[PDB]
Amino acid sequence: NEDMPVERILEAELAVEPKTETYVEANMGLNPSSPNDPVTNICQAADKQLFTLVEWAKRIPHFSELPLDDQVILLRAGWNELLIASFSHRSIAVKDGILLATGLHVHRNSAHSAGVGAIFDRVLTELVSKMRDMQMDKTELGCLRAIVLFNPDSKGLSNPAEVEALREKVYASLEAYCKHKYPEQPGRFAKLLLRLPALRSIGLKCLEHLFFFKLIGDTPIDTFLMEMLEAP
Amino acid sequence: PESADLRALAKHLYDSYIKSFPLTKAKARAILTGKTTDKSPFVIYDMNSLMMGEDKIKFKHITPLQEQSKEVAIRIFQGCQFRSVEAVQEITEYAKSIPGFVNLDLNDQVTLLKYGVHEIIYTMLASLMNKDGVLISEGQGFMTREFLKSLRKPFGDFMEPKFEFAVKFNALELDDSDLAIFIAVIILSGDRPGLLNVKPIEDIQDNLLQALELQLKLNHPESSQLFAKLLQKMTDLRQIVTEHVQLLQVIKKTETDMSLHPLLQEIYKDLY
Amino acid sequence: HKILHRLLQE
Amino acid sequence: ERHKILHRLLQEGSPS
Ligand SMILES: CN(CCOc1ccc(C[C@@H]2SC(=O)NC2=O)cc1)c1ccccn1
Numbered sequence: 297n298e299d300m301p302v303e304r305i306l307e308a309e310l311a312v313e314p315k316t317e318t319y320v321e322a323n324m325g326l327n328p329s330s331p332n333d334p335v336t337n338i339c340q341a342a343d344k345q346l347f348t349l350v351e352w353a354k355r356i357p358h359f360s361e362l363p364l365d366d367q368v369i370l371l372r373a374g375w376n377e378l379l380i381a382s383f384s385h386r387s388i389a390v391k392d393g394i395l396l397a398t399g400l401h402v403h404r405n406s407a408h409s410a411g412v413g414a415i416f417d418r419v420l421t422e423l424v425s426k427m428r429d430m431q432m433d434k435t436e437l438g439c440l441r442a443i444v445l446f447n448p449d450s451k452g453l454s455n456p457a458e459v460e461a462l463r464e465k466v467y468a469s470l471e472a473y474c475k476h477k478y479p480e481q482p483g484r485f486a487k488l489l490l491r492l493p494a495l496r497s498i499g500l501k502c503l504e505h506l507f508f509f510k511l512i513g514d515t516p517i518d519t520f521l522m523e524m525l526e527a528p
Numbered sequence: 529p530e531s532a533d534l535r536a537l538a539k540h541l542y543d544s545y546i547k548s549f550p551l552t553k554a555k556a557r558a559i560l561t562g563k564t565t566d567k568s569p570f571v572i573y574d575m576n577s578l579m580m581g582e583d584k585i586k587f588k589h590i591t592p593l594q595e596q597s598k599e600v601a602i603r604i605f606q607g608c609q610f611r612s613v614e615a616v617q618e619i620t621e622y623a624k625s626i627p628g629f630v631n632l633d634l635n636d637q638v639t640l641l642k643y644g645v646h647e648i649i650y651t652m653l654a655s656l657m658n659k660d661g662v663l664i665s666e667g668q669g670f671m672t673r674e675f676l677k678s679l680r681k682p683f684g685d686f687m688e689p690k691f692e693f694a695v696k697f698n699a700l701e702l703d704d705s706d707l708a709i710f711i712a713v714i715i716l717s718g719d720r721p722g723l724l725n726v727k728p729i730e731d732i733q734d735n736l737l738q739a740l741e742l743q744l745k746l747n748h749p750e751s752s753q754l755f756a757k758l759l760q761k762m763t764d765l766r767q768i769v770t771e772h773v774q775l776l777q778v779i780k781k782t783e784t785d786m787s788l789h790p791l792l793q794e795i796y797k798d799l800y
Numbered sequence: 801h802k803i804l805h806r807l808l809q810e
Numbered sequence: 811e812r813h814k815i816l817h818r819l820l821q822e823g824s825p826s
């Protein structure tokens with residue numbers, strides 16, 4: 297519609313949750329696999345969401361119009377941040393824990409009893425509670441995620457400039473959206489943008505761990521993720 | 529707040545910024561271009577030249593902090609460290625000039641410095657850089673990017689990421705008055721790990737952000753989405769810092785006698 | 801990257 | 811942790 301129409305970004309989000317049905321199979325009814333280790337559950341959820349992430353990317357205006365090889369570069373550079381942002385937001389409903397896309401509810405201590413504390417505690421303090429305290433809506437999260445997707449500095453990109461311009465198209469729509477919808481709070485736009493530094497440092501520490509799981513293995517991990525996990 | 533207020537805040541910050549930081553972007557840029565006749569920076573592009581720029585202080589008075597005998601790579605590394613020690617002090621002073629900062633929980637003040645200091649150093653470092661190098665020692669020397677990039681083992685790439693960030697950052701063409709506000713915005717970040725009272729901090733950064741936007745609108749009318757582009761750099765800075773920390777672990781593992789300056793070990797311990 | 805790539809062009 | 815040196819700078823400042 298208008299280059300980066302906020303309505304479609306929300307649609308991309310809506311079109312690929314969660315939302316009924318899914319929030320039951322891995323936290324109340326049956327459940328496949330049957331593993332006995334809690335870092336495994338998150339890695340399983342990540343792998344699953346990787347397929348959906350591609351679906352979402354195609355719905356964000358102008359992504360699928362970009363050169364195919366660029367599309368690949370962007371999803372390989374922002375998948376962990378895009379993913380962390382989704383489950384972080386989905387977890388606002390819960391107090392001190394995370395909600396996976398496979399219906400599993402992971403609790404604080406569990407994260408600790410697995411040696412993944414702190415990094416897990418940062419998500420609750422630096423991401424989840426912040427999104428909760430300012431009550432970011434689904435549209436705002438979609439645009440932030442879009443801003444992240446369209447990262448121009450992703451090594452190898454064919455034409456960086458055109459990616460930066462899309463990201464700017466997103467900045468504008470988000471800002472317009474915030475003023476129209478949240479006139480009572482003038483600095484909401486900057487506040488949404490300042491959610492990104494924590495997503496960034498947290499995402500980097502997350503990739504640090506994953507490669508501290510590849511090198512050692514033992515009951516390895518799902519494909520696609522391993523494919524994403526081959527460093528950029 | 530109100531315009532007259534946002535502008536006063538802007539002016540207040542700029543002045544203490546002039547007071548706290550000796551080589552401003554203005555003066556810096558003055559040197560990298562041609563302005564000011566008195567002395568061009570001494571260019572250091574290789575081992576012998578480093579020697580000349582170094583051993584110049586040998587003629588000069590004896591201040592130094594690692595007079596050679598210890599390989600090139602390590603002398604430069606220790607030089608950056610010492611420049612950083614100076615910077616943390618200039619930064620700490622500026623922080624104290626930010627309204628409502630010294631009225632915060634003392635432990636929160638330190639946390640803000642602890643995580644904000646390196647992000648600021650890298651931001652301001654850009655002011656002293658062009659695509660070929662960076663001014664050093666109050667601008668008495670200019671060390672080339674090619675020389676830093678040629679250093680041996682892991683030191684060969686400890687500056688290259690900073691240069692790359694500087695290239696894009698300088699592309700926003702901010703000046704000292706823009707920077708003075710932005711730096712404050714960085715210091716007053718309510719998302720630092722371990723903060724006790726977020727509310728007070730975010731309330732201060734809220735006003736600083738409004739000041740920054742106005743400053744940018746007035747000082748850069750034709751620059752669109754500059755405000756947003758500038759805040760986005762705050763995520764880049766975050767990456768340069770975790771990436772540098774990772775590089776520090778490596779050095780520590782491959783260098784027998786690492787040894788980091790006390791103030792720095794203090795900052796790097798339990799960081800992010 | 802086989803998977804990611806296959807999923808992108810359908 | 812402590813950060814004793816940062817405290818010093820915050821409290822008294824930088825000497826010559
Ligand atoms: C290349 N230059 C310019 C300064 O460039 C800097 C690069 C990195 C830092 C951060 C330090 S380095 C570290 O490991 N930890 C830190 O806090 C600070 C400054 C030199 C080199 C030798 C002597 C003086 N100037």
Ligand SMILES: CC1=C(/C=C/C(C)=C\C=C\C(C)=C\C(=O)O)C(C)(C)CCC1
Nearest residue numbers: 341342345376379383396397412502505
């Ligand atoms: C958070 C977290 C980690 C990694 C997560 C990544 C890279 C993606 C998660 C996506 C999810 C959880 C998606 C969903 O379910 O929708 C690691 C394993 C390092 C350790 C524990 C904390």
